[PDB]
Amino acid sequence: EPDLKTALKAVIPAKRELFKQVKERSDEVIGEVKVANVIGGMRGLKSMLWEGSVLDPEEGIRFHGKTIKDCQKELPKGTSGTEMLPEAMFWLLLTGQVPSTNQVRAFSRELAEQSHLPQHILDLIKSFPRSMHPMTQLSIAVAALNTESKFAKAYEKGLSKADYWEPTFDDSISLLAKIPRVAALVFRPDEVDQVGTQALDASQDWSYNFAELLGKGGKENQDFHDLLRLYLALHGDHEGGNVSAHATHLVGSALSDPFLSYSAGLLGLAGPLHGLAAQEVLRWILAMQDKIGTKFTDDDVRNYLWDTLKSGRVVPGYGHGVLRKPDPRFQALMDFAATRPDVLANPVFQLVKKNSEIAPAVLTEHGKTKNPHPNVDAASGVLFYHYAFQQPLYYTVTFGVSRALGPLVQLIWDRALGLPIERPKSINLLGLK
Amino acid sequence: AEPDLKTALKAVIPAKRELFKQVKERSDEVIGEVKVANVIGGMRGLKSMLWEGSVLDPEEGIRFHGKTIKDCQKELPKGTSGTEMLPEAMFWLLLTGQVPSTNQVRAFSRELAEQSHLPQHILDLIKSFPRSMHPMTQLSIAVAALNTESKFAKAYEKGLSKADYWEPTFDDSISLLAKIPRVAALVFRPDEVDQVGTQALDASQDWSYNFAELLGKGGKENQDFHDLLRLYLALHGDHEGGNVSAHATHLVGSALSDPFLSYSAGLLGLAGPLHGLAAQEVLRWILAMQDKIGTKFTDDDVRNYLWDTLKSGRVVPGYGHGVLRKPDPRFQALMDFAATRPDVLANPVFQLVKKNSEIAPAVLTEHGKTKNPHPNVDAASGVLFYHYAFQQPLYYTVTFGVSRALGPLVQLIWDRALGLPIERPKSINLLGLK
Ligand SMILES: O=C([O-])CC(=O)C(=O)O
Ligand SMILES: O=C([O-])CC(=O)C(=O)O
Ligand SMILES: [Cl-]
């Protein structure tokens, strides 16, 4: 059966024809720009192209029209376990098609084989102080991988616009292969020489191998391997509007290669209002457990919610900029938890769950939070914590692994369609008067 | 004892917050349309971001709180010696809307010299870089790594009111400005990391002078180059919010990533061939022109070479603007620097820039595919650096990177002071447009 590159090569003509048709309608009006859009971070403004996913305010995120549940049903699984593979999600995002299981196996083999790192990346990582925030470490080491960029070199030689997409593809695959190893090196700074050169099991999936590099390989960790697969698939893409996806696209649009461009995305993911949300939730939950105890009641949880809000604080992991109904990424994680009795017996999980049953009504009554349903960040941290990954500073590093998926797909499409530099116009306050 | 920078900014914040409230009361007002062309065309045409410090005027070029380049050359404080406006003074104007006194700038230059030292780990990180790692990659990486020193990131982690966000933003912005010329010099001088990375700076010298000293271009003998450098860094500090470096800084910053991470994103955008490379392209093109036509050129030779470039299907770099309808006043400010240095004027490469600026606009109009075919700043900057023996064009973007910290850091400070939200547009697929 076709490999990924071949499969992408077969859908490129249909995408280019679709693009030509849309371009023939260039003069068509689709929206207004208001003052609110200028001062409000472009919120509500339909102004960028993004092929792979469309975030529906009522249904949540869809991937070529498929729900999360559709993807959990249709996408190939690992050689063992129950959860859909992130490599299969990548295939679907890129091509618009669901790969066969043996297509995904040949693709997982590519990701295991291209995972090795040049020596200088080991040296760079070993120079980091141990107190350097893990997302800073991750962003820096991805950027540094630009020494290996095929796009950057091919471009420097003279490269036709028609040939841009293929080196972009080769670099994207290279990045995906290497990023879990860079992530594990962030986690395991005393073992950089071992973990940074360890050969990966050639028949295991991307997430399994990631877990092995984290020191969480083997039979004993098989539920965690499924969590990881699900988590990485769920977080791979969420439209083009989010800061990490947009930053990748923006930097990429200047023809910076995928290593540089996704490094910009990771720097945006390091933001407290973007990728660090999950870490903040776990901290807030643990401080709540600390005050009210493991034999907490609804009443305890309700008072702590009210005490948080009355002090002028936010309840993290609730509300969204676009979403209007409960986040189907949150629900898919809650559904994973529902069938693991040991997760359900964990009080920190019980606390997350009870909080998800009470918080939405408290927040509505308090009245300052837009659509106060749980988002994915409400739950992800506590599930990692359960599996003895009790170092919340590193949860965002896993988000960084996942989130390479969707934005790299769109970079490939950007270069294949020949999209120009992203260049809005700016204005001052005095100009708006 | 006149206000320091922080105090001066603190005095204009209330007026800016009142102006912002007034604009916000007009939230529902329509200012333009979104067309299909805008979505597929990289938001070109779309007025969709706030940027306070600079605005492009179609007749007068870039203006900084309404001040032309000529106004800034007249009014802004100069160094203890030399003829050119200081970048520290441009920063002050961008941030505050006001012109600092000369002693205000001196107190500010002293702060920048005092905070210029680097943690040891940044020396170690830079020494790990391979020799072939592109300089902009090195610069972006080392700026990000300075986030270990971020007061915003730690203050935020402790609990910080929204109203106080701007202050740690400001402290980190100043810290970044202080350190970036030392990081830049380390990018230029990878064999001397230990020496250049700990070298004590003259405590009463300006930002650019000290940068030049760290580059190995200190002293009386380099005083004209110190003026060039001052002017270059001032002229390139800000040019609206739409350009990739400014926008990326703003975008990353809007997620509350600290200024080190945020400007590191800008530098990654500046590394992009369609953003960071114009000055290098002009120098190459000018030297290849000198190479083919020699030192004894005439108007007619220059004219034929322009036409031969355009007939080959090639661009004449450093000419053209989308809006601006006269020469770029940044170009002219560089030409005015040259006018008083006889040795620059005797350099044939400069003579070639100049004659080319007198002939190219008419040739390009007659050719007809370049909108407003007047010189831009890039037409001159590279050749002036080349004259001063700064003949490693691969590193010109590093110097642009130093300059371009100025405007975007100012906007980050204003973003946090006004409490602007996360930048998050809506996206759409091709099928949704059809
Ligand atoms: O999968 C889709 O969304 C349809 C598709 O391939 C295209 O847009 O050409
Ligand atoms: O390759 C094509 O047919 C379309 C093209 O030129 C581009 O990528 O801009
Ligand atoms: Cl494959």
PDB file of N, CA and C in Angstrom, chain A residues 21 25-28 30-31 33-36 41 45-51 55 120 124 127 136 146 239-241 246 254 256 267 271-273 422-429 433, chain B residues 26-29 31-32 34-37 42 46-52 125 128 130 137 147 240-242 247 255-257 264 268 272-274 423-430 434:
ATOM      1  N   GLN A  21     -10.402  27.297  -7.513  1.00  0.00           N
ATOM      2  CA  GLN A  21     -11.812  27.643  -7.469  1.00  0.00           C
ATOM      3  C   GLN A  21     -12.165  28.672  -6.394  1.00  0.00           C
ATOM      4  N   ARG A  25     -13.019  33.285  -6.592  1.00  0.00           N
ATOM      5  CA  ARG A  25     -13.919  34.074  -5.785  1.00  0.00           C
ATOM      6  C   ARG A  25     -13.238  35.013  -4.798  1.00  0.00           C
ATOM      7  N   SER A  26     -12.062  35.545  -5.145  1.00  0.00           N
ATOM      8  CA  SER A  26     -11.327  36.442  -4.268  1.00  0.00           C
ATOM      9  C   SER A  26     -12.096  37.654  -3.742  1.00  0.00           C
ATOM     10  N   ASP A  27     -12.926  38.257  -4.579  1.00  0.00           N
ATOM     11  CA  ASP A  27     -13.604  39.523  -4.199  1.00  0.00           C
ATOM     12  C   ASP A  27     -14.784  39.321  -3.271  1.00  0.00           C
ATOM     13  N   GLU A  28     -15.179  38.074  -3.021  1.00  0.00           N
ATOM     14  CA  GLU A  28     -16.320  37.749  -2.153  1.00  0.00           C
ATOM     15  C   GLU A  28     -16.141  38.099  -0.684  1.00  0.00           C
ATOM     16  N   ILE A  30     -16.910  37.836   3.233  1.00  0.00           N
ATOM     17  CA  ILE A  30     -17.325  36.818   4.196  1.00  0.00           C
ATOM     18  C   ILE A  30     -17.542  37.295   5.657  1.00  0.00           C
ATOM     19  N   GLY A  31     -17.229  38.543   5.950  1.00  0.00           N
ATOM     20  CA  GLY A  31     -17.314  39.037   7.330  1.00  0.00           C
ATOM     21  C   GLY A  31     -17.013  40.509   7.382  1.00  0.00           C
ATOM     22  N   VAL A  33     -14.834  43.579   9.785  1.00  0.00           N
ATOM     23  CA  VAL A  33     -13.835  43.877  10.803  1.00  0.00           C
ATOM     24  C   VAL A  33     -14.421  44.989  11.651  1.00  0.00           C
ATOM     25  N   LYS A  34     -14.535  44.736  12.942  1.00  0.00           N
ATOM     26  CA  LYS A  34     -14.904  45.747  13.881  1.00  0.00           C
ATOM     27  C   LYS A  34     -13.764  46.174  14.802  1.00  0.00           C
ATOM     28  N   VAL A  35     -13.962  47.349  15.387  1.00  0.00           N
ATOM     29  CA  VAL A  35     -13.084  47.849  16.415  1.00  0.00           C
ATOM     30  C   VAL A  35     -12.838  46.742  17.410  1.00  0.00           C
ATOM     31  N   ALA A  36     -13.874  46.060  17.898  1.00  0.00           N
ATOM     32  CA  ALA A  36     -13.699  44.913  18.826  1.00  0.00           C
ATOM     33  C   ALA A  36     -12.651  43.862  18.412  1.00  0.00           C
ATOM     34  N   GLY A  41      -7.774  41.002  20.163  1.00  0.00           N
ATOM     35  CA  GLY A  41      -6.920  39.881  19.781  1.00  0.00           C
ATOM     36  C   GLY A  41      -7.451  39.093  18.615  1.00  0.00           C
ATOM     37  N   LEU A  45     -12.755  36.896  14.313  1.00  0.00           N
ATOM     38  CA  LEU A  45     -12.375  37.232  12.973  1.00  0.00           C
ATOM     39  C   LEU A  45     -11.919  35.989  12.198  1.00  0.00           C
ATOM     40  N   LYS A  46     -12.714  35.597  11.193  1.00  0.00           N
ATOM     41  CA  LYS A  46     -12.331  34.573  10.230  1.00  0.00           C
ATOM     42  C   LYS A  46     -11.298  35.142   9.247  1.00  0.00           C
ATOM     43  N   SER A  47     -10.034  34.871   9.494  1.00  0.00           N
ATOM     44  CA  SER A  47      -8.975  35.512   8.731  1.00  0.00           C
ATOM     45  C   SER A  47      -7.800  34.617   8.360  1.00  0.00           C
ATOM     46  N   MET A  48      -7.870  33.341   8.667  1.00  0.00           N
ATOM     47  CA  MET A  48      -6.798  32.429   8.292  1.00  0.00           C
ATOM     48  C   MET A  48      -7.321  31.085   7.842  1.00  0.00           C
ATOM     49  N   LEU A  49      -6.609  30.499   6.886  1.00  0.00           N
ATOM     50  CA  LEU A  49      -6.880  29.208   6.341  1.00  0.00           C
ATOM     51  C   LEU A  49      -6.262  28.104   7.205  1.00  0.00           C
ATOM     52  N   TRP A  50      -7.033  27.048   7.449  1.00  0.00           N
ATOM     53  CA  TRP A  50      -6.552  25.876   8.208  1.00  0.00           C
ATOM     54  C   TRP A  50      -7.398  24.680   7.766  1.00  0.00           C
ATOM     55  N   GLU A  51      -6.744  23.674   7.157  1.00  0.00           N
ATOM     56  CA  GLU A  51      -7.471  22.616   6.418  1.00  0.00           C
ATOM     57  C   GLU A  51      -7.917  21.453   7.289  1.00  0.00           C
ATOM     58  N   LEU A  55     -13.246  23.925  14.292  1.00  0.00           N
ATOM     59  CA  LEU A  55     -13.667  23.887  15.680  1.00  0.00           C
ATOM     60  C   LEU A  55     -15.028  24.431  15.609  1.00  0.00           C
ATOM     61  N   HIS A 120      25.526  17.428  18.871  1.00  0.00           N
ATOM     62  CA  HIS A 120      25.446  18.780  19.393  1.00  0.00           C
ATOM     63  C   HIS A 120      24.148  19.088  20.126  1.00  0.00           C
ATOM     64  N   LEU A 124      24.017  20.660  23.851  1.00  0.00           N
ATOM     65  CA  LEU A 124      23.190  21.810  24.121  1.00  0.00           C
ATOM     66  C   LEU A 124      22.309  21.527  25.347  1.00  0.00           C
ATOM     67  N   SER A 127      24.099  21.496  28.656  1.00  0.00           N
ATOM     68  CA  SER A 127      24.406  22.849  29.135  1.00  0.00           C
ATOM     69  C   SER A 127      23.247  23.511  29.880  1.00  0.00           C
ATOM     70  N   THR A 136      10.900  25.898  27.951  1.00  0.00           N
ATOM     71  CA  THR A 136      12.010  26.684  27.407  1.00  0.00           C
ATOM     72  C   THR A 136      13.028  25.715  26.821  1.00  0.00           C
ATOM     73  N   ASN A 146      17.253  22.858  13.615  1.00  0.00           N
ATOM     74  CA  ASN A 146      17.287  23.499  12.280  1.00  0.00           C
ATOM     75  C   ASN A 146      18.618  23.278  11.534  1.00  0.00           C
ATOM     76  N   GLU A 239      -7.704  23.754  15.201  1.00  0.00           N
ATOM     77  CA  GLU A 239      -7.867  24.948  14.291  1.00  0.00           C
ATOM     78  C   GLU A 239      -6.583  25.682  14.213  1.00  0.00           C
ATOM     79  N   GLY A 240      -6.571  26.742  13.400  1.00  0.00           N
ATOM     80  CA  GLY A 240      -5.415  27.596  13.232  1.00  0.00           C
ATOM     81  C   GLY A 240      -5.311  28.776  14.140  1.00  0.00           C
ATOM     82  N   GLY A 241      -6.392  29.083  14.879  1.00  0.00           N
ATOM     83  CA  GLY A 241      -6.467  30.250  15.733  1.00  0.00           C
ATOM     84  C   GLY A 241      -5.697  30.223  17.038  1.00  0.00           C
ATOM     85  N   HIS A 246      -0.893  29.089  15.267  1.00  0.00           N
ATOM     86  CA  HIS A 246      -0.775  30.372  14.527  1.00  0.00           C
ATOM     87  C   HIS A 246       0.688  30.848  14.430  1.00  0.00           C
ATOM     88  N   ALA A 254       7.090  33.123   6.541  1.00  0.00           N
ATOM     89  CA  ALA A 254       8.284  33.789   6.126  1.00  0.00           C
ATOM     90  C   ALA A 254       9.344  32.851   5.497  1.00  0.00           C
ATOM     91  N   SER A 256      10.667  30.310   7.070  1.00  0.00           N
ATOM     92  CA  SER A 256      11.455  29.629   8.081  1.00  0.00           C
ATOM     93  C   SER A 256      11.085  28.180   8.010  1.00  0.00           C
ATOM     94  N   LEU A 267       7.187  28.127  21.997  1.00  0.00           N
ATOM     95  CA  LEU A 267       7.279  29.348  22.761  1.00  0.00           C
ATOM     96  C   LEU A 267       5.912  29.970  23.080  1.00  0.00           C
ATOM     97  N   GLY A 271       3.160  29.750  27.108  1.00  0.00           N
ATOM     98  CA  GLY A 271       2.409  30.825  27.718  1.00  0.00           C
ATOM     99  C   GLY A 271       1.432  30.247  28.744  1.00  0.00           C
ATOM    100  N   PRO A 272       1.363  30.829  29.941  1.00  0.00           N
ATOM    101  CA  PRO A 272       0.272  30.588  30.910  1.00  0.00           C
ATOM    102  C   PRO A 272      -1.165  30.561  30.395  1.00  0.00           C
ATOM    103  N   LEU A 273      -1.517  31.381  29.396  1.00  0.00           N
ATOM    104  CA  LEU A 273      -2.889  31.384  28.861  1.00  0.00           C
ATOM    105  C   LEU A 273      -3.085  30.377  27.722  1.00  0.00           C
ATOM    106  N   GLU A 422       2.309  35.837   6.066  1.00  0.00           N
ATOM    107  CA  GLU A 422       1.203  36.401   6.813  1.00  0.00           C
ATOM    108  C   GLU A 422       1.569  37.829   7.189  1.00  0.00           C
ATOM    109  N   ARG A 423       0.807  38.809   6.727  1.00  0.00           N
ATOM    110  CA  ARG A 423       1.080  40.259   6.971  1.00  0.00           C
ATOM    111  C   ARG A 423      -0.234  41.086   7.182  1.00  0.00           C
ATOM    112  N   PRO A 424      -0.814  41.072   8.394  1.00  0.00           N
ATOM    113  CA  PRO A 424      -1.940  41.999   8.648  1.00  0.00           C
ATOM    114  C   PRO A 424      -1.487  43.457   8.644  1.00  0.00           C
ATOM    115  N   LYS A 425      -2.419  44.382   8.673  1.00  0.00           N
ATOM    116  CA  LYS A 425      -2.112  45.790   8.872  1.00  0.00           C
ATOM    117  C   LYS A 425      -2.352  46.164  10.329  1.00  0.00           C
ATOM    118  N   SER A 426      -1.508  47.007  10.910  1.00  0.00           N
ATOM    119  CA  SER A 426      -1.688  47.473  12.286  1.00  0.00           C
ATOM    120  C   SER A 426      -2.185  48.912  12.324  1.00  0.00           C
ATOM    121  N   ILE A 427      -2.664  49.332  13.477  1.00  0.00           N
ATOM    122  CA  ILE A 427      -3.185  50.700  13.681  1.00  0.00           C
ATOM    123  C   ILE A 427      -3.060  51.049  15.153  1.00  0.00           C
ATOM    124  N   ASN A 428      -2.912  52.326  15.468  1.00  0.00           N
ATOM    125  CA  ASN A 428      -2.889  52.824  16.857  1.00  0.00           C
ATOM    126  C   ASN A 428      -4.275  53.244  17.393  1.00  0.00           C
ATOM    127  N   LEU A 429      -4.376  53.415  18.704  1.00  0.00           N
ATOM    128  CA  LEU A 429      -5.601  53.861  19.338  1.00  0.00           C
ATOM    129  C   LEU A 429      -6.097  55.160  18.741  1.00  0.00           C
ATOM    130  N   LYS A 433      -9.998  56.216  16.673  1.00  0.00           N
ATOM    131  CA  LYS A 433     -10.862  57.387  16.854  1.00  0.00           C
ATOM    132  C   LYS A 433     -11.145  58.214  15.567  1.00  0.00           C
TER     133      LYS A 433
ATOM    134  N   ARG B  26     -16.528  52.233  21.473  1.00  0.00           N
ATOM    135  CA  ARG B  26     -16.870  52.050  20.067  1.00  0.00           C
ATOM    136  C   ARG B  26     -16.600  50.640  19.507  1.00  0.00           C
ATOM    137  N   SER B  27     -16.670  49.612  20.349  1.00  0.00           N
ATOM    138  CA  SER B  27     -16.385  48.229  19.923  1.00  0.00           C
ATOM    139  C   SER B  27     -17.198  47.723  18.708  1.00  0.00           C
ATOM    140  N   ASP B  28     -18.482  48.090  18.622  1.00  0.00           N
ATOM    141  CA  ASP B  28     -19.343  47.540  17.576  1.00  0.00           C
ATOM    142  C   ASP B  28     -19.164  48.183  16.215  1.00  0.00           C
ATOM    143  N   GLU B  29     -18.394  49.255  16.148  1.00  0.00           N
ATOM    144  CA  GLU B  29     -18.171  49.989  14.904  1.00  0.00           C
ATOM    145  C   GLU B  29     -17.358  49.215  13.839  1.00  0.00           C
ATOM    146  N   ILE B  31     -14.966  48.848  10.624  1.00  0.00           N
ATOM    147  CA  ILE B  31     -13.849  49.542   9.984  1.00  0.00           C
ATOM    148  C   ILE B  31     -13.339  48.952   8.643  1.00  0.00           C
ATOM    149  N   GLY B  32     -13.858  47.806   8.222  1.00  0.00           N
ATOM    150  CA  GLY B  32     -13.474  47.227   6.944  1.00  0.00           C
ATOM    151  C   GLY B  32     -14.212  45.945   6.709  1.00  0.00           C
ATOM    152  N   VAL B  34     -13.903  41.719   5.390  1.00  0.00           N
ATOM    153  CA  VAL B  34     -13.095  40.543   5.193  1.00  0.00           C
ATOM    154  C   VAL B  34     -13.553  39.911   3.903  1.00  0.00           C
ATOM    155  N   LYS B  35     -12.638  39.772   2.959  1.00  0.00           N
ATOM    156  CA  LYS B  35     -12.875  39.032   1.764  1.00  0.00           C
ATOM    157  C   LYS B  35     -12.107  37.728   1.715  1.00  0.00           C
ATOM    158  N   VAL B  36     -12.600  36.854   0.826  1.00  0.00           N
ATOM    159  CA  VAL B  36     -11.929  35.619   0.528  1.00  0.00           C
ATOM    160  C   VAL B  36     -10.445  35.918   0.361  1.00  0.00           C
ATOM    161  N   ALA B  37     -10.106  36.899  -0.489  1.00  0.00           N
ATOM    162  CA  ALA B  37      -8.696  37.300  -0.718  1.00  0.00           C
ATOM    163  C   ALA B  37      -7.833  37.516   0.540  1.00  0.00           C
ATOM    164  N   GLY B  42      -2.854  35.792   3.340  1.00  0.00           N
ATOM    165  CA  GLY B  42      -2.023  36.077   4.481  1.00  0.00           C
ATOM    166  C   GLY B  42      -2.409  37.316   5.226  1.00  0.00           C
ATOM    167  N   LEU B  46      -5.832  43.612   5.770  1.00  0.00           N
ATOM    168  CA  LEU B  46      -6.749  43.493   6.890  1.00  0.00           C
ATOM    169  C   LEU B  46      -6.254  44.267   8.095  1.00  0.00           C
ATOM    170  N   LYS B  47      -6.940  45.357   8.458  1.00  0.00           N
ATOM    171  CA  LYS B  47      -6.557  46.111   9.654  1.00  0.00           C
ATOM    172  C   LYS B  47      -7.078  45.423  10.910  1.00  0.00           C
ATOM    173  N   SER B  48      -6.233  44.658  11.573  1.00  0.00           N
ATOM    174  CA  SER B  48      -6.685  43.790  12.625  1.00  0.00           C
ATOM    175  C   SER B  48      -5.808  43.701  13.863  1.00  0.00           C
ATOM    176  N   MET B  49      -4.773  44.519  13.957  1.00  0.00           N
ATOM    177  CA  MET B  49      -3.995  44.559  15.171  1.00  0.00           C
ATOM    178  C   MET B  49      -3.634  45.975  15.625  1.00  0.00           C
ATOM    179  N   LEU B  50      -3.551  46.139  16.925  1.00  0.00           N
ATOM    180  CA  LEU B  50      -3.139  47.339  17.587  1.00  0.00           C
ATOM    181  C   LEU B  50      -1.608  47.467  17.671  1.00  0.00           C
ATOM    182  N   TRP B  51      -1.107  48.664  17.384  1.00  0.00           N
ATOM    183  CA  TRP B  51       0.328  48.952  17.448  1.00  0.00           C
ATOM    184  C   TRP B  51       0.512  50.465  17.654  1.00  0.00           C
ATOM    185  N   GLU B  52       1.042  50.849  18.821  1.00  0.00           N
ATOM    186  CA  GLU B  52       0.946  52.233  19.302  1.00  0.00           C
ATOM    187  C   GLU B  52       2.068  53.159  18.846  1.00  0.00           C
ATOM    188  N   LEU B 125      25.870  27.297  26.888  1.00  0.00           N
ATOM    189  CA  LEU B 125      24.956  27.017  25.822  1.00  0.00           C
ATOM    190  C   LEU B 125      25.556  27.467  24.487  1.00  0.00           C
ATOM    191  N   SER B 128      28.290  25.294  23.133  1.00  0.00           N
ATOM    192  CA  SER B 128      27.755  24.061  22.564  1.00  0.00           C
ATOM    193  C   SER B 128      27.347  24.195  21.095  1.00  0.00           C
ATOM    194  N   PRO B 130      27.256  24.232  17.230  1.00  0.00           N
ATOM    195  CA  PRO B 130      28.213  23.994  16.132  1.00  0.00           C
ATOM    196  C   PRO B 130      28.532  25.288  15.384  1.00  0.00           C
ATOM    197  N   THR B 137      19.589  31.444  14.248  1.00  0.00           N
ATOM    198  CA  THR B 137      19.175  30.323  15.102  1.00  0.00           C
ATOM    199  C   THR B 137      19.860  30.493  16.451  1.00  0.00           C
ATOM    200  N   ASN B 147      15.248  33.431  29.532  1.00  0.00           N
ATOM    201  CA  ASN B 147      13.987  33.321  30.308  1.00  0.00           C
ATOM    202  C   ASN B 147      14.205  32.766  31.726  1.00  0.00           C
ATOM    203  N   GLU B 240       5.691  49.429  12.567  1.00  0.00           N
ATOM    204  CA  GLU B 240       4.294  48.966  12.618  1.00  0.00           C
ATOM    205  C   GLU B 240       4.314  47.522  13.140  1.00  0.00           C
ATOM    206  N   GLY B 241       3.120  46.972  13.381  1.00  0.00           N
ATOM    207  CA  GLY B 241       2.947  45.659  13.935  1.00  0.00           C
ATOM    208  C   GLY B 241       2.793  44.512  12.970  1.00  0.00           C
ATOM    209  N   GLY B 242       2.619  44.815  11.682  1.00  0.00           N
ATOM    210  CA  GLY B 242       2.319  43.828  10.639  1.00  0.00           C
ATOM    211  C   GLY B 242       3.469  42.897  10.195  1.00  0.00           C
ATOM    212  N   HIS B 247       4.976  41.006  14.869  1.00  0.00           N
ATOM    213  CA  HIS B 247       3.698  40.290  15.079  1.00  0.00           C
ATOM    214  C   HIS B 247       3.906  39.009  15.897  1.00  0.00           C
ATOM    215  N   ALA B 255      -0.030  35.364  24.892  1.00  0.00           N
ATOM    216  CA  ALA B 255      -0.299  34.187  25.724  1.00  0.00           C
ATOM    217  C   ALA B 255       0.321  34.293  27.153  1.00  0.00           C
ATOM    218  N   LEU B 256       0.990  35.423  27.447  1.00  0.00           N
ATOM    219  CA  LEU B 256       1.686  35.735  28.681  1.00  0.00           C
ATOM    220  C   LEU B 256       2.998  34.994  28.807  1.00  0.00           C
ATOM    221  N   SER B 257       3.531  34.527  27.679  1.00  0.00           N
ATOM    222  CA  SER B 257       4.930  34.160  27.639  1.00  0.00           C
ATOM    223  C   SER B 257       5.718  35.424  27.894  1.00  0.00           C
ATOM    224  N   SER B 264      12.149  35.979  21.354  1.00  0.00           N
ATOM    225  CA  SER B 264      12.775  34.854  20.697  1.00  0.00           C
ATOM    226  C   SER B 264      11.901  34.369  19.476  1.00  0.00           C
ATOM    227  N   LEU B 268      12.986  34.242  15.459  1.00  0.00           N
ATOM    228  CA  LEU B 268      12.680  33.107  14.599  1.00  0.00           C
ATOM    229  C   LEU B 268      11.927  33.522  13.284  1.00  0.00           C
ATOM    230  N   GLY B 272      13.498  34.177   8.820  1.00  0.00           N
ATOM    231  CA  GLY B 272      12.835  33.732   7.612  1.00  0.00           C
ATOM    232  C   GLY B 272      13.360  34.511   6.430  1.00  0.00           C
ATOM    233  N   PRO B 273      13.727  33.821   5.339  1.00  0.00           N
ATOM    234  CA  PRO B 273      14.239  34.443   4.113  1.00  0.00           C
ATOM    235  C   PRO B 273      13.383  35.577   3.513  1.00  0.00           C
ATOM    236  N   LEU B 274      12.057  35.542   3.642  1.00  0.00           N
ATOM    237  CA  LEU B 274      11.180  36.633   3.157  1.00  0.00           C
ATOM    238  C   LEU B 274      11.031  37.790   4.150  1.00  0.00           C
ATOM    239  N   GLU B 423      -4.021  36.818  21.412  1.00  0.00           N
ATOM    240  CA  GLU B 423      -4.358  36.930  19.987  1.00  0.00           C
ATOM    241  C   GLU B 423      -4.856  35.541  19.537  1.00  0.00           C
ATOM    242  N   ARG B 424      -6.116  35.436  19.146  1.00  0.00           N
ATOM    243  CA  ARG B 424      -6.749  34.183  18.689  1.00  0.00           C
ATOM    244  C   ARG B 424      -7.795  34.390  17.559  1.00  0.00           C
ATOM    245  N   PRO B 425      -7.352  34.565  16.297  1.00  0.00           N
ATOM    246  CA  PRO B 425      -8.305  34.635  15.192  1.00  0.00           C
ATOM    247  C   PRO B 425      -9.089  33.340  15.003  1.00  0.00           C
ATOM    248  N   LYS B 426     -10.125  33.416  14.174  1.00  0.00           N
ATOM    249  CA  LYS B 426     -10.824  32.235  13.706  1.00  0.00           C
ATOM    250  C   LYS B 426     -10.228  31.725  12.401  1.00  0.00           C
ATOM    251  N   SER B 427     -10.125  30.402  12.242  1.00  0.00           N
ATOM    252  CA  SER B 427      -9.632  29.816  10.982  1.00  0.00           C
ATOM    253  C   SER B 427     -10.782  29.173  10.225  1.00  0.00           C
ATOM    254  N   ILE B 428     -10.548  28.840   8.975  1.00  0.00           N
ATOM    255  CA  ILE B 428     -11.543  28.208   8.099  1.00  0.00           C
ATOM    256  C   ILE B 428     -10.808  27.389   7.044  1.00  0.00           C
ATOM    257  N   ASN B 429     -11.427  26.303   6.601  1.00  0.00           N
ATOM    258  CA  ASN B 429     -10.868  25.431   5.540  1.00  0.00           C
ATOM    259  C   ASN B 429     -11.365  25.832   4.145  1.00  0.00           C
ATOM    260  N   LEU B 430     -10.699  25.314   3.107  1.00  0.00           N
ATOM    261  CA  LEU B 430     -11.128  25.649   1.751  1.00  0.00           C
ATOM    262  C   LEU B 430     -12.569  25.262   1.522  1.00  0.00           C
ATOM    263  N   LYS B 434     -15.962  27.610   0.036  1.00  0.00           N
ATOM    264  CA  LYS B 434     -16.716  27.292  -1.191  1.00  0.00           C
ATOM    265  C   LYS B 434     -18.239  27.017  -1.029  1.00  0.00           C
TER     266      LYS B 434
END
